Symmetry: D2
């Protein structure tokens, strides 16, 4: 053609057609072949993408995910669909069914967690539900009665078992838990992970995604799998992990999300007359983690830093996670204006060569930047959506609209890619990525 | 709410979400519970609804339908999905696998046909394909190489076995073959069908659709099932049906569709360098049936009449089938202007009480009109789409746009109903009707 | 016939067509016949309306208004179009040309003021300009250079001459300064306005709007025109009005708008490197007037109260001005929930008879309510846009969107009415109202 | 920066803003500076542009034009705005006021004609009026009553005084009458135009458009202005022009437009019960001019040829005027397929360097092609709209839609240019061109 792009109605139709095609029945895979199981924070966004189409089916997505919740509250980052292959590491390597005392009985799950965006999904379902009338409000509200206690247990587990010293920051024991697997953020902590006798394995992800420049390297995967052996050797016991894991970092992006989530959950809890003590705790957590995020920021730029617990040192990198405090609030006026100038300037959204005015995962002027390699440079619709929605919540209506408009424009070819090359716009990663389709549907409300 | 309607992007998304949810794998049911199998002219419209979403999946819908084609060319009106129940009459009553010499080996089908809209689906797939670039044009074009000969056999069977005297009109042996089961069109022919020893049966359609005023009556169903016994007793042999069937009528609406279809197939055949003899025959048929439709029309109003072969009399009724000549062309200038005035006036689209300016299936001032009862009055999106698309083909751009706009407005509540009450807009029939969702997607291109 | 509403592009086109049709060259009349001159806060919304069409002409609109600013900083509420009559009271009745020491010389203006929404217009122009490229950005930055000093003198005149005791609320000397001429808010205050020898006059407004139920009474105009005589007798001198004016009320809605306008101007001042002393003054007024608004609020509902300076009494009425604190923030979390609940509940937006989910000027359950009568009941697009824009600034993205979407639906008949009957939707006041067209252009984008 | 294009509602608003900005009161200038008067076929498109905005003002536009009609029926191609200069040749140079027996008295006009697109404007007004209700319908029906006799005298003057031998083609006495002033179509004819003692002059057009590559040469203007002297020497007398004019060509594009215009007027005449004798005349001219167009056509491609009356020779050029028969129909099926194939192929719309799938005025492979130079290459929104509307009338719904969609994409930069560089998209000619704005308003609806 002369134009290979789609109209907004065509695009919304194709996006809904992808989400239904990735539906197994009660769960939606993050991707048809690359990720043929339910991932934790993908399921939350799939629920957002489904809320315009069927509030009852979006409630089901979350229902299915909470039924995989561990006995201590942890929401695992993968719920394995029964009998599916083609993804490594599968439940055999995790062995949580055998080893994890808190693992659920009805499901096969991984042994690590992922950021708590689930409250954001609940509010979007609620907002759609209130525009659809009496029968549909009842479905969302019944969900709240079924799962409020389980949402609380999820937030309580993060606040108490992953913030053991009440520092207002979430501790991670695997890079995978950040959702940003190979981010330059973790390079200096992964450098101190020394794999021992690691059992033989073959990769699956790079049989599907065959370009080596779009996925993590083989050395990187050996370390991801070694941390798994460490957790296994201790039967996934929370009390014992701090003493054995050779990867312990406080994730500032994860912490900022949790702050926002607690605040969102707190407001839902007020709107629907939930136990006062739960609401007060949620507000408590929301402020502790807001303050924890702010304690990491550079005094001049506002840029948030992660923290290496084993090294006892701030990790200074130039990735989009520096902008964590923009999501949760709490910076002094002057510092937040400096942080926004960093975001809008030539190190990020204002880099002269970007095809779209979107946020690259790593700054193109960082020595660590790689235009194609997963989290080392590419632009992700997941970050566009999250930043856009959080900005609207801060009251930055025009900034949020600009992100939403550039995201829709990048997505308008219908690739629904996992991520995009920052300079050429080339769709990279998995195509048919549920999460990208869900961003599009939410942006086209 | 204050407004229970959807935006165009929301509506297109919901429509695509319905079509994918009604997908069994290779076939799409006409409706989730009411019609849990593939119907012949529904599959053609589903292919149109799918062409914006996936040209390859729309090709598959047609591929699946032609694989059910009989050995003489007849496309049957139902392809039964294997192991499905909840629809009567199912393959056990038809018994075509046992009795029909021309029945296909790989499928269970009914023993009657349905209007040949399939060429229209092929052109829409082609038009979408040419806007999507080189790989997707190849998929549509390979379809044409696979199935051109089977499309020809389909049109050839209608022209030769259902127009045995070359009168330019299609003969039907069941009301179901018209697609308008209980239309007042057939009342005076059904009155001369006298059921004999008809084996016991229970209805399914009215266990699903429980309001008696939306479906045909019990007396009506006994006659539909009796004609089935007549066809069975003669093993569905084309040569023997004229001598035994107690229902034989020439369908003018069906004939007009066939004329249009031949013309559309002829033009495709020219564009893609198909055998010259096939194209010349298609143009031949297109003009024979155009002329056959025109031979039925009232000299003053242009209204087309059906013909009772057994009675040897014109059937004069006031339903939307009178407007058949508007679809295929061929009327003298003055007669077509009179036919359009009938369509736009108070007997149809201009009736003062219509909620939308759409075409009711039966004129609200006919003695036969029933606002709720299937084809005896309700407004159907299927007719809106067909009339709208045929009008655009005649060059009546503004008329086609007005139909398309009123149809989109009626559909904007998201019911995707089979048909709508003409006065209140109440959604009737099956909800989640594939065909209504496909009209919406095509209208929102 | 079936649906007298316009598509979004038809509506946007008709809105722009209206705004250009009300342009006299360098000023835009607020309405073709009823208000055939430039009104102050109307002109700010016209500028907002023009920013998507022409940044240059939107700057011109503000430049024209600021060229009429008084020498002490006041922006007068009417700038009269040269040689234009048909509005009363016209320049001859105000006599500011001959009496007022501070009046401008190139221009004929009124002698009172109106809410400082101008900072919001400037912000929207700048946001539009930033999306349009370098030439267009230069135009808006040059406007800032030309007018920043004038915008300051405007805010400083309000902060020092209308808040003479640093109470953080703006004192009005005329109901007209509030923009809600006949609101129930002022009835207690007006009843203590006893006119003496008031020079004869004939109204012009009810010659154009002849329905008496849509305009203020003859008795009300007598008090409006008498307040002019009191200011005239003292030559519009600021120092003397507190001694002679029979009408002195602190306006909490005006005050909240000023709080927001100061914060908006202060942030503009920071992004474009205006003098630090000005930015500091602007932040200090933002906070004082936020606090001054909150100090009026009802301890159970959070509803803001106006104050009668002469009687030293709080004015307790049931109008849209109660929601002032939602615009500028500042309420404790719990009272703000209560206030939103009053907004959304059965006394305002959730009232069961309302055609649209919009804010009535006066509550429909108030003894003071009148569905047709100006600010005593009707729904104003004016209020919708302001609340929608301010809610988005608060971070209430979904609330802002529901207001915007109901506004567009009420406007979709293309009447562009000054105000609308809350129960029936009937358009009231002047048609072709510039402000309504501007709101639509801004919402549609 | 990243994307200088406008959304559909922003674009529709800017188009309406432009059209109102070019309104002088009762006439709309074709462009602000370049064409500061009313041009005949421009004014018909402006009327089309205004019908969605105000049926009343669109009627006024046509009424103003028809008030300048000559006494023999000719509609002159320029109606001069009183006291306006800056265009040459102005009223003083034409001298129709003093020389022309048939010129109007209330008005100053040119002395030549232009294509009869007026019937199409009338049709679009009527279609808009029918959707707007009774008051608006009355306005358009009253226009018909007022002007039907004038529209007839217009078509009759063309049919009898410009087709003096009933050949079914319109004779032009000036290239300007064709609306394609410097098209290669006329170069052979112009080379036999030898000017004598031609009174001195200074061009105005290239003072506004100073780039010489976008306008006709000084040599061409000398021939244009000399043809004026030849008509002046004979006082614009129709009977005498055939004897004295050095330029006499039958214009096949003009003729096809007339064929369509007659058919459109004849159908208007039937729907509104105009005199049967007029309707009959209109149908008879529709057919004669259809046949006269077809008689010129190339036997292999179907391409229409203009005819040089003086030299008795067919003019064979490679311009968009070759596709005249597609507008009015009439070609045998096989030659029309060939003609569409030439339109869609590599010499016109399918040329590989074209930025948009639009029709260049001259084929890019022609020796005559010039990408910047007026009608010698550039793409005209004028042509797009006319072909798109006529294709839809032919029943070519998808072809019409692809033209419309490429037109909108080229217009989406908001330049509203007179014509566009075919390879780069650069806007050329006058910006703010009324006709371009009108096309956009009509396409967007």
């Amino acid at each position: 053609p002369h134009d290979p792009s789609f109209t907004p109605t065509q695009l919304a139709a194709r996006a809904a057609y992808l989400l239904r095609g990735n539906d197994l029945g009660t769960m939606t895979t993050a991707a048809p072949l690359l990720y043929p199981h339910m991932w934790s924070w993908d399921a939350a966004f799939v629920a957002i993408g489904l809320a315009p189409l069927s509030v009852e089916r979006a409630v089901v997505e979350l229902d299915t995910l909470l039924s995989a919740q561990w006995r201590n509250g942890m929401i695992p980052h993968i719920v394995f669909a029964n009998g599916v292959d083609g993804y490594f590491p599968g439940p055999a390597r995790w062995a949580t069914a055998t080893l994890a005392d808190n693992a659920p009985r009805n499901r096969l799950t991984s042994g690590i967690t992922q950021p708590p965006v689930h409250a954001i999904a609940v509010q979007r379902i609620l907002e759609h539900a209130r525009t659809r009338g009496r029968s549909t409000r009842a479905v969302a509200e019944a969900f709240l009665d079924r799962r409020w206690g389980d949402l609380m247990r999820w937030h309580r587990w993060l606040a108490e078992c992953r913030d053991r010293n009440e520092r207002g920051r979430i501790t991670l024991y695997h890079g995978w838990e950040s959702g940003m697997d190979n981010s330059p953020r973790w390079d200096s902590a992964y450098a101190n992970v020394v794999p021992g006798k690691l059992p033989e394995y073959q990769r699956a992800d790079n049989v599907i995604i065959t370009d080596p420049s779009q996925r993590p390297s083989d050395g990187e995967y050996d370390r991801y799998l070694w941390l798994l052996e460490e957790m296994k050797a201790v039967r996934y016991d929370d009390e014992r992990l701090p003493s054995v894991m050779s990867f312990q970092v406080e994730d500032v992006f994860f912490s900022a999300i949790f702050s926002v989530a607690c605040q969102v959950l707190a407001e839902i809890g007020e709107d629907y007359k939930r136990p006062h003590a739960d609401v007060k705790d949620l507000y408590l957590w929301a402020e502790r983690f807001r303050a924890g995020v702010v304690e990491t920021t550079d005094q001049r730029t506002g840029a948030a830093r992660d923290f290496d617990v084993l090294a006892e040192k701030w990790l200074v990198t130039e990735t989009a996670a520096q902008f964590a405090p923009l999501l949760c609030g709490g910076l002094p006026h002057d510092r937040e204006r400096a942080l926004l100038k960093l975001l809008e300037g030539p190190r990020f959204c204002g880099h002269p060569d970007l095809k779209y005015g979107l946020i690259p995962s790593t700054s193109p002027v960082s020595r660590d930047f790689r235009p194609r390699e997963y989290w080392r440079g590419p632009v992700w619709p997941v970050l566009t959506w999250l930043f856009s929605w959080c900005f609207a919540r801060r009251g930055w209506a025009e900034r949020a609209r600009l992100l939403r408009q550039e995201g829709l424009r990048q997505a308008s070819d219908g690739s629904f890619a996992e991520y995009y090359e920052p300079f050429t716009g080339e769709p990279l990663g998995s195509m048919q990525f549920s999460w990208t389709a869900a961003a599009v549907l939410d942006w086209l409300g």
